[PDB]
Amino acid sequence: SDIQMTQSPSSLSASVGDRVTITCRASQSVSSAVAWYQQKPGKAPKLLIYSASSLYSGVPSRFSGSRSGTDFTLTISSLQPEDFATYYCQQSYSFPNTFGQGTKVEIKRTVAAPSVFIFPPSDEQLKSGTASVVCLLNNFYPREAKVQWKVDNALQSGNSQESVTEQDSKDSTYSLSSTLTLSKADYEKHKVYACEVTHQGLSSPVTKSFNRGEC
Amino acid sequence: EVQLVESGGGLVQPGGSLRLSCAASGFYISYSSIHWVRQAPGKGLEWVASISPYSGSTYYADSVKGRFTISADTSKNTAYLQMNSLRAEDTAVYYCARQGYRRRSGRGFDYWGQGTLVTVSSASTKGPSVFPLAPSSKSTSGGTAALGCLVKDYFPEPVTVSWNSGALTSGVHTFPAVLQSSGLYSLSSVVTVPSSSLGTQTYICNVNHKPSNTKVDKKVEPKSC
RNA sequence: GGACAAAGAUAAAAACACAACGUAUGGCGAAACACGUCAUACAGAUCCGGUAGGUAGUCCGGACAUAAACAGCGGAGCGCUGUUUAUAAGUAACCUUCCUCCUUAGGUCGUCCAUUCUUUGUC
Ligand SMILES: Nc1ccc2cc3ccc(N)cc3nc2c1
Ligand SMILES: [Mg+2]
Ligand SMILES: [Mg+2]
Ligand SMILES: [Mg+2]
Asked: How many CB atoms lie within 10 A of CB A186?
């Protein structure tokens, strides 16, 4: 039977100087054969802790590791701006090796309302034979937001794809784009298209809409 | 001084074979365990395979058992991962890692490569079709409007987007590409500009897709009335 | 006094040779497994009877314990249970008694200790 490593929490929000703890629970004994790593987006992981308590050469002291039974914790005594990354735990007691699902450490910030814009399909795209309508939610925090597309005030499901940016270096906010892809004919069968955003910063749903064939 | 460089990734069709290499420098692979770990785009690390020192013992994960072979060539100081009968789920960045000395670093992986991308897909290289996202015809909210381009139906990655030939770099968000049901990628790049400039200033996005040899400059302007 | 006899108490006591693979755990070797090396442990010298009175780590016989092979049971592999076999060569070799034409053998009888003192019966 393979060993499972369950990492909690999947995502954590904290500020510079915070003490952070991430835990990993093993389905069976793994003794002390546990390691932790830090992967910054687009970069290879870097070894942080080995043998589940030992600090790897050259790693900052603030990072520590503790073992209680089959539970292992990684602790940063005081966060620094360079310490915001995804963190992984790994067991190496028995093959096959297994990794934790990861924990992303993000900057904590003021609740920020999204600025919402709606872009109608371009004429070149309708000449190409497809229609895409793009909603943009700009500079908002936290990353938890919802977009409800409405064609002629009719809710649409399964035709919308979303994409979110990594937290900004300066504003520490996330931006989201939602794209609704409809057939050119279907885009030409409906007169009203709206984007409804429900976010914590938004006291009420904020909707930005256009009509088919209007300026 | 210690370095690992993976190579040999790329795009392969489902059911096809690929062979990854991990060239080492600053150490001899015979005295260490070598591991291959893959990371699917937007997903976590997944251990793939390992080779032990002085025995050649090979260990694999269930997801790859029977289809992957890990080997080592000491004279070329290089590890290898042979993948046969590949499928879309194998698409990932593959790192090779050195396992550290047990006395110094336990069983942790102390050095990794930059990774190499493996894309399993039947899609053919397509040049991106860049469309224009017009700034709001109505007055913008906040006094700054948003104008963007849509780089849609391009394979494979990556694309590069500049604005005004790179003169406009502040406030631009290029979104991560999303794979659509077609198997082709799509993304959008948007910029916020002062609304006073929308009629006075012309905004162009420059999209480059080197794999297809595609350079496009698309002008985004407000629409009629 | 001495002799024979029985019954007691006491003491004694087996030659030569006794091997060689390997397994497990842990440490170390640039070392999760394999490999090499070192340390430690295991690798029937348990119990009983007999062997014309006695002496067995090695006999003969049996039991038990432990290991291997085979059979059965439960959820190919894995774990147990039951049976068989094994646990040196060797009670081989030499010497020796008897028997058998397995006779250039096979079996079998021996190889060691049995001292000292006490009581009684009859000469
Ligand atoms: N070599 C031998 C031969 C026969 C033996 C017979 C014995 C009978 C009883 C005992 N206690 C020890 C014995 N030892 C013997 C040693
Ligand atoms: Mg006896
Ligand atoms: Mg003796
Ligand atoms: Mg015998």
From this structure: 11
Distance of alpha carbon A14 from alpha carbon A184, whole angstroms = 45
B225, A215: Cβ pair inside 8 Å?
A: yes
Q: Provide the H-helix boundaries in B21-168.
A: 102-105
User: Inter-chain contact B107–A138, Cβ cutoff 8 Å?
Assistant: no
Kindly provide the resolution of this structure in angstroms, with one decimal. 3.0
B153 token code pair = 């139906």
Per-residue buried b or exposed e for A27-44, using 16+ beta carbons within 10 Å of the residue's own CB: eeebebbbbbbbbeeeeb
**Residue A157: C-alpha distances to residues A55, A99, A160, B21, B182 (Å):** 49, 34, 7, 44, 18
In angstroms, what is the span from residue B142 Cα to ligand 3's centroid?
109
User: Is B225 contained in some domain?
Assistant: no
Q: Are residues B167 and B79 in the same domain?
A: no
Is the CB of A97 less than 7 A from some atom of nucleic acid strand C? yes
Query: By what technique were these coordinates determined?
Result: X-ray
Q: Which CATH number fits domain A110-215: 2.60.40.10, 3.30.2130.30, 1.10.150.130, 3.10.129.10?
A: 2.60.40.10
